[PDB]
Amino acid sequence: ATDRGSESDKHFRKVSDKEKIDQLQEELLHTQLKYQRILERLEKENKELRKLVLQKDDKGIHHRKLKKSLIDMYSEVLDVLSDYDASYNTQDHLPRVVVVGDQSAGKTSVLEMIAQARIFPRGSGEMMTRSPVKVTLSEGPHHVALFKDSSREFDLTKEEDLAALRHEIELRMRKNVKEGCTVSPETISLNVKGPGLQRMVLVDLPGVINTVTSGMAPDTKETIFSISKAYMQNPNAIILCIQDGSVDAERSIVTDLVSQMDPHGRRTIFVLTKVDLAEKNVASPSRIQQIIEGKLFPMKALGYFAVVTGKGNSSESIEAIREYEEEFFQNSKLLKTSMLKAHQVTTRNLSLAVSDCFWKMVRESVEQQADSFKATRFNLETEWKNNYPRLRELDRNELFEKAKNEILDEVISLSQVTPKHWEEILQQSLWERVSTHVIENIYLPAAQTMNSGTFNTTVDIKLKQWTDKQLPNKAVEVAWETLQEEFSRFMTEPKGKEHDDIFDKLKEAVKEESIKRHKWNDFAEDSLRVIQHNALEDRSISDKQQWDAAIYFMEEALQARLKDTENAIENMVGPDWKKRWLYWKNRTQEQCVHNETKNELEKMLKCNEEHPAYLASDEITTVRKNLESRGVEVDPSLIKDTWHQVYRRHFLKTALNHCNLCRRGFYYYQRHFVDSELECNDVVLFWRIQRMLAITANTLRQQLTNTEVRRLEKNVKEVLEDFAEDGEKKIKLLTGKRVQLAEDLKKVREIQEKLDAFIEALHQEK
Amino acid sequence: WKMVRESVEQQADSFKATRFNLETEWKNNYPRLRELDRNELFEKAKNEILD
Ligand SMILES: Nc1nc2c(ncn2[C@@H]2O[C@H](COP(=O)(O)OP(=O)(O)O)[C@@H](O)[C@H]2O)c(=O)[nH]1
Ligand code: ALF
Ligand SMILES: [K+]
Ligand SMILES: [Mg+2]
């Protein structure tokens, strides 16, 4: 009878097994223990069956050391790195090839005529590049590129598919840009296969703008510079410097961006675009001869200075661009009358030369990263472990689940609270809430008559009306709060000096959802009304012990009121001579008035001890004249306020003296046959309420332990499952700086594997 | 029929548990009457009154 919710769950839980254990045992334990093992061993078979078919498309199985997915290893390493750390602290050490040049140059053309002319939005009229776009190029058949690493199935040779693919990239480009600028560092990941593509990662960084026009947000050019740090602070970056062939080199921006990155040109190759505009204006090949020699290019870029040319139409196909480029370069005086042989100028030579320089840098510098990340992990683990010796290995998934079980365990522990605590806490809390209402609004005005029948009649009518409207509504609220008060203590209270504060955000977050769903039984009040009516209706106290308990607790309530009034009075009247002379204090003129106003009222009560609480205006006038006769002029309102506090002090002392004789007078045996005027009807009123609330608490406790705590437990389970799926809150709640460090350690460990996997793939040559 | 077959078996356990809890308390408070009915109660009075 102490608790019934736990028994119900066990009974039906066994029933479920009795009917379905022959299916549950296989699914719940046998399958799950084998499930993890088969992931390593049997999924291996299905992965290999498809992988081999995919490798045949790659040709990796057919040809040793030659596989189109071999270059995809390089991108996988960077994809983890960008997710692990997209900031300069990690990005600055990641090898890459970047397209750098004046925005007007159309610098991206170096990549458009390879694969991107079909799927990347282009054309003049507006700035196209909005954020770094990385394209993973690989020798292979035509295949729809990955867009934001998402799979696609499109034909790259038909306009209808390509147009939709151009839309997809544009959406990422603009969405990466936030208010205040037109460019964003947030990168876009593309991976395309097709003929003529080289194994390398080329990034089209947003074009630099000398000045921010009114058509662009003010921070455009500063943002591009910060994005330009992808190479300016990256010793592993290869820079393709694009000179806008429409304008002279002395008008360029790229010269300063790269010359401050590598003034020796060791990390860069200079490329020129739109050279054919030289013949749409008065061509000056003598300036081109300086261009090839790098006289006017401070970065002294190394390699052959390739040139890109195009019809300028934004619909020219990749094949059309290649054919146009070859014919123009092989005949134009810009290159035929200067030392720029077309077979070195052609973009396809740049792609090969860029691919050649790409693998040179990657193999040389990649091994340094493996040592760097390993050193990082050891330094992080040493400090992380020393500050958190308890957690040698931690994850945010492990952190959440521990709380999930811990929370459910505590709420169950809350369900283990004995009724003794519930009944005492509910009874004590509820009575204290309504202890003054009865005294001030029911008892004291009823005490103004000497007719005990009216006294009991008056209160009973008020109580029944009060009972119907207030008592069960306050009682449930106390019970609802009382359960939450213990729940919070069970939930988030520390175990002395040991406490995992890392879990407090989730615990309180779970509570708020669980209390919102904690709807107390809407009919609990109806039972209490019947109970309270019966508890009040039965006023028969035939037991001395019932009398003894009721009177002592009534005294405490009255003594509390007496001190409450007395403390208010002392402030109203101030210190007496004992404290005025002891602490060198004095009275305010109001306190002086109150003391004399008090004295006159005390004298009035000294004789008229039975004076009713209500004062006649003649008494108010009498006091005023009695005080005015001593030089004290008092507003009637002061007297009435003084009167109320002093009267209760007078009354309450009388009531306690009545209580003293009620217990003592009846206690003496020979006095029980003396019918004195000591009808302790207040003890009858107090006793019934004490019993009435005690029964109320028991009804609340029964509902508390039978229905409400189970609803609280059920809601917690519903909320915790929502949190289990709510990754963002789990991240937002689990921010303890050790799980985040543990998360970083995991990512560092993964990168070390990914770094070595690619490095291991480099070592396939020997 | 999906809901009825799934949940109906729970009722059988619930009612059986109800009877055992009711019989335990009912029998303990009324050990004399292991089985009682309002028809048996009336007839006993009928004979008792006539006697
Ligand atoms: N004349 C000429 N036009 C080009 C060349 N490369 C690209 N374009 C034109 O520039 C426009 C878009 O090229 P794109 O590489 O996207 O430059 P961006 O949009 O300014 O970054 C298209 O209309 C192309 O025809 C080139 O080498 N010569
Ligand atoms: F014109 Al650009 F990136 F070269 F938008
Ligand atoms: K442009
Ligand atoms: Mg562009």
Curated annotation (Swiss-Prot), chain A:
Impact reported for L54A: In mutant control 2; does not affect ability to mediate mitochondrial fusion
Location of the region described as G5 motif in the Swiss-Prot/TrEMBL record: 307-310
Outcome of substituting G106E: In OPA1; abolishes GTPase activity without affecting the ability to bind membranes; loss of function in promoting mitochondrial fusion
Consequence when changing I188M: In OPA1 and BEHRS
Signal sequence region: none
Residue sites binding Mg(2+) per the record: T108, T129, D204
UniProt-annotated stretches for the region Stalk region: 395-642, 680-734
Annotated segments matching region G2 motif: 127-130
Membrane-inserted regions that do not cross the membrane: 577-587
Mutagenesis or variant effect for R251H: In DOA+ and OPA1; decreased GTPase activity; loss of function in promoting mitochondrial fusion
Annotated consequence of substituting E250A: In interface mutant 5; strongly decreased ability to mediate mitochondrial fusion
Effect on the protein of changing L49A: In mutant control 1; does not affect ability to mediate mitochondrial fusion
Effect of M127A: Strongly decreased GTPase activity
Variant or mutagenesis effect after changing Q23A: In interface mutant 9; strongly decreased ability to mediate mitochondrial fusion
Effect after changing Q591R: In OPA1; loss of lipid binding and partial loss of function in promoting mitochondrial fusion
Outcome when changing C357Y: In OPA1 and DOA+
Outcome following mutation: E126A: Decreased GTPase activity
Annotated spans, G1 motif: 101-108
Positions of region (Paddle region): 542-662
Impact upon substituting E432A: In interface mutant 1b; strongly decreased ability to mediate mitochondrial fusion
Result, substituting I541A: In interface mutant 4b; strongly decreased ability to mediate mitochondrial fusion
Region spans: G3 motif: 204-207
Dynamin-type G domain sequence ranges: 91-367
Mitochondrial intermembrane topological domain residue ranges: 1-576, 588-766
Name of this protein: Dynamin-like GTPase OPA1, short form
Protein's organism: Homo sapiens
Gene: OPA1
